Ligand binder design. Structure first.
Ligand SMILES: Nc1ncnc2c1ncn2[C@H]1C[C@H](O)[C@@H](COP(=O)(O)OP(=O)(O)OP(=O)(O)O)O1
Ligand SMILES: *P(=O)(O)OC[C@@H]1CC[C@H](n2cc(C)c(=O)[nH]c2=O)O1
Ligand SMILES: [Mg+2]
Length: 1011
DNA sequence: GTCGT
DNA sequence: ACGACTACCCGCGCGCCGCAGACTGTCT
DNA sequence: AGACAGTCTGCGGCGCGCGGG
């Protein structure tokens, strides 16, 4: 009756026969049986050492449902043909591009709209250029409005100029540039092209577009990338440039280029630096000042020079692209990369105008009131203190007040006249005078972040006033008889120089001296000093009675800081967004579906925001957004944290979204398990694959119960260990999570956890230094082994590394921890590209009404009508299983576990939030939001409308034309170098747990080598 | 790239 | 001089130091 | 009636801590 589960030697489930046939086809192995016997004995020893042999795992019923068929005999052929289908039209336009440039017109004309100039003929007026490929540039005035002012375009046969009606006679500055994007397929090349895309008229539609905007900055960051090592390497480049500019003679190859050949590899991302590095062109940026004016009559003059400057920028961009493009084509030869690059450039954000304005007003109105209410009282306190000038004894017999500078400057007297020498507050103490910046200032300036805040307040650490020392920071005084006693609680003595400084400071006031000075502890360590006392770290110490105040203002200050830090950080970015309403452009906001189907209300308000996304702005080739990839989540106390809830779907539509579970951990486990050619060969892989999230048995949750912390903190703890964190930092993090623990406990727990995870180290001559005896030793050794290759490539697709981080350019400096993370963090991007390609292929094939809305890292959302929601979820599941199967096949394994095949949850909602069940209550927002829906695979299958429907026959016919070429995987050519006996003896030494075993196996290997 | 034995 | 080291992004506020710039007071 | 040498008086760039994903 029921199908029997299929289980490999270790207790893990695989896919059913139906899914096996529909995904992997007919594949057989058993070629390496003789090697697999010895490998299985070694794996048996490794698993029995850690007590994981014969342990129970989760087993469920098989899952069977019909998938769409594949287009090849292997996954690689299928993905290549789909990528060629999806990137065929525009890539032919990218090649055969013109290399010669036509001449410029002698004189330009000021007419509203689009004017075409062809050399040898009279200029004409056109509605739109109607060209396959153009180079584009836009200029706007940013102090009057956000709308464009003029535009220039170049093609292979003519020049095009666009002029706004605002500068040709008129008072309405709202206008947009038309390009007929909804009907004509075209490629537009530019530098930071998203800013230019935001000013196009036909981009403000819910219906999809047919234009491809390409950026040269991403192409420069990918190949010939800037170092971007998050290192002083950026400072190193700047100081080299300063030194080279300073000295006419440049013997660079003599000293600094010999030690650091990386210096002459790349430059900065700006257009000036990129153009200067790639070509011998010098550009001028002065003319930008002409666009900083408020009046428009200045733009009427100097028309010719501004237009010529725009044309020069266009020419420079054209030459830069012509130089860069083939190198990027050589570095990334797979079509899926280009398809994903095209796909990641069409984001859109629906909003509403009035709600946006109300949200902004509420946030600002709360923030300013909260700031002013606490800033009012400190001035009164200062004015109360300031009347003690006449009597010295009060402030000379007080502990806190005696650390101020009370010296007064005498009144100057020029001969026979008033001084009038720009004096500031004559006959006043120095600390009072220092508050006022200028003569015009009448009210003192003070914030809660000023240095003298503890002195103005009365702050005590264990009933001892705080003292400021220039060398060490904040300190407190301990009597002699207890100096040893306070050393029992891990209090570090201050530096000696501070001791003499305190000695003379007291001696100037007499009072002899008692005790020594200890330092207030700092969370990062004993070496770092303390300079602030109202941060998050000292909030805990305000409770439990360690830090105490004689005034009621400190706790309020802590509340206000914690409530307003994020809004203070992000207010300028948030308030400057460009929002376009429906009232101004009544012929553009067209529905995604072809049929209108009414759904019209009494003048409803809608708006669209186009994000400024740079597709490839990282060495690991991730995307960059300054505002929308850094948005905070909703919190009860935090002000203005409901930003992402402002994205609302129009009536009759919804959002469908998904997020990937434990991506890089799974990738690392697969890389570790690839050696034994079995799932669960290593201990870490068996621990990772034995549980799943829906029953609360995943690795992060288990670490959370072992360490007694949250899952988010456990993620940081687990990733830090993998990416190279020491045991001391781990103990510091453990104390950070639980601040009521002693240092000794954290040290023993950290050492015990690190000993089990990583074994001892063995150093030899013929074999280099390696770890042994640990559960993850093989994974680590494989990480440095692949990091030390001559030509590193991503294991799945085969993308090369940037020239800055290559071995030959790095002579002395190494940057190893940045070289190790690169492969995993780039596979994380290959995953997203494959997902996007699969989803958009399915959307084209089955005629679904959907469009990509937003793509945060490892999280994707789509805007879908009411009818086709479950079909979109189904397509998401199919894309996920195809991507995982491709990753498994590229490593040399033709099997897939059942537990990790599908998404845990799929979210259907009307707004963007982390969880569908959140209420999103903030101090700014007093209204709850209704909950959404979340579904897993079985409940999705139970739905009646989950089925796809009938396909289109012509799509497969078009796809079948493209060609396929066989390529060898990268790990095979890596393995070609090493001899088999070397690998077997090395792994046999790695699986041992004792030094004598390693020595005797090394001796046997040496004897075999001699024999 | 940067800092201790 | 060798070995050990969480990784990739974004940005605001406060203290410090190097220079323009105005005010006299002899000095011519 | 200038010449110029001190003599203060701010103003701007830099860097590093401190927070968000
Ligand atoms: N401190 C960190 N250090 C290094 N990498 C991190 C760190 N935090 C997050 N990441 C990495 C790992 C992830 O691939 C990715 C973050 O995506 P994320 O979804 O939050 O983690 P996750 O997918 O493993 O958990 P979950 O299953 O809950 O989604 O970047
Ligand atoms: P936020 O919702 O917290 O994070 C979403 C994405 C996932 C990946 C990226 N990211 C976040 C954090 C906190 C990190 O340390 N590293 C990341 O890459 O932000
Ligand atoms: Mg995730």
């Amino acid at each position: 009756t029921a199908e029997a589960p299929r289980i490999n030697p270790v207790g893990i489930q695989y896919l059913g026969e139906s899914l096996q046939r529909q995904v992997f086809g007919s594949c057989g192995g058993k070629d390496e049986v003789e090697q697999s016997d010895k490998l299985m004995e070694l794996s048996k020893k490794s698993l029995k050492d850690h007590g994981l042999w014969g342990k129970k795992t989760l087993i469920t019923d098989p899952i069977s449902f019909p998938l769409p068929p594949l287009q090849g005999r292997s996954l690689d052929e299928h993905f290549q043909k789909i990528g060629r289908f999806n990137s065929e039209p525009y890539k032919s336009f990218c090649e055969d591009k013109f290399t010669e440039m036509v001449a410029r017109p002698a004189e330009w004309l000021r007419k509203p709209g689009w004017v075409k100039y062809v050399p040898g003929m009279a200029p004409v007026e056109v509605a739109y250029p109607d060209e396959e490929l153009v180079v584009f540039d836009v200029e706007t005035l940013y102090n009057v409005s956000d709308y464009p002012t003029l535009a220039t375009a170049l093609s292979s046969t003519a020049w095009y100029l666009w002029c706004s009606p605002f500068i040709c006679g008129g008072d309405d500055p709202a206008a947009l540039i038309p390009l007929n994007t909804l009907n004509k397929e075209q490629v537009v090349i530019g530098h930071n092209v998203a800013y230019d895309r935001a000013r196009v008229l036909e981009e403000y539609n819910f219906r999809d577009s047919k234009a491809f905007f390409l950026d040269t900055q991403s192409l420069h960051i990918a190949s010939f990338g800037l170092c971007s090592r998050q290192r002083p390497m950026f400072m190193k480049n700047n100081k080299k440039k300063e030194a080279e500019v300073e000295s006419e003679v440049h013997p660079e190859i003599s000293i600094e280029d010999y030690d650091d050949p990386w210096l002459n590899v790349s430059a900065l991302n700006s257009l000036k630096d990129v153009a200067k590095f790639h070509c011998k062109i010098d550009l001028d940026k002065t003319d930008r000042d002409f666009f900083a004016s408020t009046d428009k009559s200045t733009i009427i003059e100097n028309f010719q020079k501004l237009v010529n400057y725009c044309a020069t920028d266009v020419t420079a961009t054209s030459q830069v692209f012509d130089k860069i493009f083939p190198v990027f084509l050589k570095k990334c030869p797979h079509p899926v990369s280009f398809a994903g690059l095209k796909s990641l450039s069409k984001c859109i954000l629906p909003t509403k105008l009035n709600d946006w304005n109300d949200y902004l007003n509420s946030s600002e109105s709360l923030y300013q009131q909260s700031k002013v209410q606490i800033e009012s009282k400190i001035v009164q306190i200062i004015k109360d203190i300031a009347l003690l000038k006449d009597k010295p004894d009060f402030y000379l017999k007080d502990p806190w007040l005696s650390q101020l500078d009370w010296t007064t400057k005498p009144l100057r007297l020029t001969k026979k006249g008033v001084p009038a020498k720009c004096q500031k507050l004559p006959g006043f103490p120095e600390w009072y005078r220092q508050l006022f910046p200028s003569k015009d200032t009448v009210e003192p300036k003070i914030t809660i972040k000023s240095r003298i805040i503890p002195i103005l307040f009365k702050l005590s650490w264990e009933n001892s006033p705080v003292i400021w020392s220039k060398e060490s920071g904040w300190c407190f005084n301990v009597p002699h008889e207890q100096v040893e006693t306070y050393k029992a609680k891990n209090y570090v003595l201050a530096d000696s120089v501070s001791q003499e400084e305190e000695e003379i400071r007291m001696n100037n006031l007499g009072l002899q001296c008692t005790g020594v000075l200890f330092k207030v502890p700092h969370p990062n360590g004993p070496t770092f000093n303390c300079t602030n006392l109202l941060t998050k770290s000292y909030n805990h110490f305000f409770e439990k009675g360690v830090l105490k105040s004689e005034s009621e203002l400190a706790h309020q200050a802590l509340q206000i800081n914690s409530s307003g830090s994020y809004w203070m950080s992000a207010r300028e970015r948030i308030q400057s967004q460009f929002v376009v309403p429906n009232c101004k452009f009544p012929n553009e906001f067209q529905s995604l579906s072809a049929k209108s189907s009414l759904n019209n209300e009494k003048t409803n308000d809608l708006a669209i925001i186009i994000p400024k996304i740079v597709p490839m702005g990282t060495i690991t080739r991730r995307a960059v957004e300054n505002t929308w990839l850094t948005a905070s989540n909703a919190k009860a106390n935090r002000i203005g944290s409901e930003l992402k809830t402002q994205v609302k779907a129009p009536p009759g539509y919804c959002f469908v979204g998904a997020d990937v579970d434990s991506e890089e951990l799974w990738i690392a486990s697969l890389v570790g398990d690839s050696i034994f050619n079995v799932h669960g060969g290593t201990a870490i892989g068996w621990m990772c694959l034995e549980g799943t999230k829906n029953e609360g048995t995943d690795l992060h949750t288990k670490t959370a119960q072992i360490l007694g912390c949250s899952r988010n903190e456990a993620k940081i703890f687990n990733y830090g260990r993998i990416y190279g964190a020491g045991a001391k930092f781990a103990s510091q993090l453990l104390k950070r999570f639980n601040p009521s623990l002693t240092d000794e406990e954290t040290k023993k727990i950290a050492n015990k956890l690190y000993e089990n995870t990583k074994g001892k180290t063995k150093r030899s001559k013929l074999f280099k230094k390696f770890w042994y005896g640990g559960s993850e030793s093989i994974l680590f050794n494989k990480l440095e082994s692949i990091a030390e290759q001559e030509t590193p490539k991503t294991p799945v697709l085969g993308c090369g590394i940037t020239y800055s981080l290559m071995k030959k350019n790095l002579r002395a400096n190494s940057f190893l921890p940045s070289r190790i993370n690169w492969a995993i963090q780039s596979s994380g991007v290959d995953y997203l590209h494959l997902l996007c390609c699969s989803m958009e292929y399915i959307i084209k094939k089955y005629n679904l009404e959907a469009r990509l809305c937003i793509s945060i890292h490892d999280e994707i959302r789509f805007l879908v009508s009411e009818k086709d929601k479950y079909r979109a979820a189904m397509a998401l599941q199919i894309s996920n299983i195809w991507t995982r199967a491709m990753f498994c096949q590229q490593m040399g394994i033709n099997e897939l576990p059942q537990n990790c095949a599908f998404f845990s949850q799929v979210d259907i909602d009307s707004v963007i939030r982390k969880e569908v069940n959140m209420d999103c209550i903030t101090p700014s927002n007093k209204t709850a939001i209704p909950h959404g829906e979340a579904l897993d695979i079985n409940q999705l299958l139970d739905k009646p409308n989950s089925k796809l429907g009938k396909p289109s026959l012509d799509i497969d016919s078009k796809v079948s034309q493209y060609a396929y070429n066989y390529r060898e995987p990268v790990f095979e050519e890596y393995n070609k170098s090493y001899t088999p006996e070397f690998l077997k003896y090395f792994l046999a030494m790695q699986v041992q747990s004792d030094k004598r075993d390693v020595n005797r196996l090394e001796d046997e290997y040496l004897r075999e080598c001699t024999s």
